[PDB]
Symmetry: D3
């Protein structure tokens, strides 16, 4: 019955895209973006659950656009909904050209995170209070995503 | 109107899990796994389409368990189905303990890859011929997955 | 001629400390922290100037404590004071252990950054307006730091 | 003792060459190639011996050309010959341009791996039996390499 | 009361600047240079103290210029002056284009390094002896730097 | 006939062994060691020839023992002998435990480096003058290594 507002789990990350992070085209290597998402989704889940977490699954990722070298890479992740031991985490990724001002949504992800105790066994997590228009929409469309997730389980 | 067998597009990775590859929970970093998954999917798509490709969307990553330090990561990637520019890539990860002989299924993943020109625009792709029992099975329930994937996008 | 509030340049970074980030003593390798400091200072300055930046110099780094595996690294940069083409960037770093809720100030640093154009030559920067009392305090004690820093250069 | 075919020990790696993997010229860093080679040889020895392994010595690395950005690195590793507690691993590295369909032989390597116990001491290994013709010719002229290597060890 | 010549502590590092070491502006990413600096400072201090060390603070980092891809990066660190348990470490970083034979001073830095026992507690370090005229000059002007650093900490 | 002393080519490197460098066994990952040798060899060869160089071959690496975490890693490279366009490079690796005083030879390697011009074509390098006892020995035994090297190519 424990309840925290979404704002509590909110995690921001701001990176600078450098040549070691690039692919063979000129944009950021997709794999780096994923490593960032997984990291921020974990921090988000930890802030909310107050315990160690494991990524149960990633329920969706789509690359709309890609950050170029020199861009600022903005990452934002928050807990959108919960089960008893699980937490749906939403991570969105923006590219920001600080020189020209141009900013676009590049990536978007949904992850299921599970909180675990010292011995690695799943642990009850507090439920999440949505407050803003965006949050309240994502809270209500989560059971629809979980039912869709549970059917993605059949091949 | 071109068709190639699955065998053509198959790509195999075999990593050795080292301390830098690990995390605070003594096991492997899930972000490292995603990096290998994206990397091998890219190669798998490329070998099939003979061109540069981008990961359009990651559709599922199911973390069943994970490898410890000193294990061997075994990755298998192959194309399961094709549209006209898009193609489904399947990636399997195994943790293989070379001392004890114990083999474990680490994670399964489904991605959608799109071949592109040097202009960065969707490019016509060859088709895929399933052959083994596994290859046939994944191919048959490929339309059902693409329909399920469509539906997730409408919240 | 141009002015902007501190709030505009503020940059937040949150990291998870993992084994490859650690050193031979079970703490976070100090060399990683400095790298994180430099990247966020560069972002901070870029956000305020809307141009490419170069780190002119680091004026001090102060290692008070340091993060452990599993901790969260919390980094905050913002612009504290400006010159004609230069900007003082203050970066502070916090270790946050989310399991027990313990939070500790790890590092503090003052850098000076210069905005640059196509040719890498100095570019006029907008000034900065402090808002909070910590921000105003830093803006006020900033000319003293530039003086101290000037005097430090001669001492060789 | 036990005897296993070469196929059992065969290990394949395939990688995508990226800018961080490259050197100050157009191509891949030679040190990245070596790290992959040591890793694959280590994996090849383990799958065969079913124990931990150390790299006793590198006997040769022949750099013929090297992969450029966007190439796939095809790496092939297998056991060629066996001693008491030693194993000869041969590593084949290919650059494969998936666009053009151009495939070149990058490098070849011969390594000696030693199986070790919990306390890092030489451990008896199973023997290897060749099945393909190239596997046969590598097996035939194995002692001739070890004889050259022994002679090499004392030319100082 | 113990005493060692600067010469003993001196640590040399030569690196090759590769594309992963670079930034969005063509030269070496400053955050990499700082990591190298911290590392060689630790190695310098470790040689003089014969114990584990921590970077207490950084006095200054002066970026004069920066290296390009393909350059040799030359680092030199030594201990310039000591306290009860602390050591001032000076590091200078030279860019060197071997092809053209052009050597340029890239960075300078002063750090305070504290020697520590097995439980992390600061422990006494031996004193240092300046020998060359440059080493003597740095030794003579060291107290003044600590004074400037002390007054720097007060400027908040 | 152009000629420089061995000392001119000499390159020293001192790294500190951190956990990202370690392997699944407590000691330094051999791969990293190889990467360090290759680097110092290239620097050494560039310094002697005043041009870009390629690592033609590695003629031997001898692993005697390993550096452990927290050790100082000491690498030293110098040109032992020269052909027309090539340079034999000797790389010795020491692990130095700075707390205990223990220093041990962990590795030795011999590399053949080739100097190249702007467009990758080989280029004549100056001959090397040995001076120290160690230097003079390795110079006189280098043709013996050259004969053994070229023979290993036939098998």
């Amino acid at each position: 019955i424990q309840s925290y507002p979404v704002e509590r789990s909110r995690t921001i990350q701001t990176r600078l895209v450098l040549p070691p992070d690039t692919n063979h085209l000129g944009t950021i290597f997709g794999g780096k973006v994923l490593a960032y998402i997984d990291e921020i989704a974990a921090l988000t889940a930890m802030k909310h659950a107050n315990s160690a977490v494991v990524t149960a699954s990633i329920d969706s990722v789509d690359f709309k656009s890609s950050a170029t070298v020199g861009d600022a890479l903005e990452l934002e992740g928050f807990v959108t909904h919960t089960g008893r031991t699980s937490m749906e985490v939403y991570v969105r990724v923006h590219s920001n050209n600080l020189l020209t001002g141009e900013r676009t949504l590049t990536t978007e992800s949904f992850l299921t995170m599970v909180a675990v105790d010292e011995s690695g066994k799943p642990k009850p997590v507090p439920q999440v209070e949505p407050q803003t228009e965006e949050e309240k929409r994502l809270y209500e469309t989560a059971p629809a995503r979980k039912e869709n997730r549970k059917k993605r389980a059949a091949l």
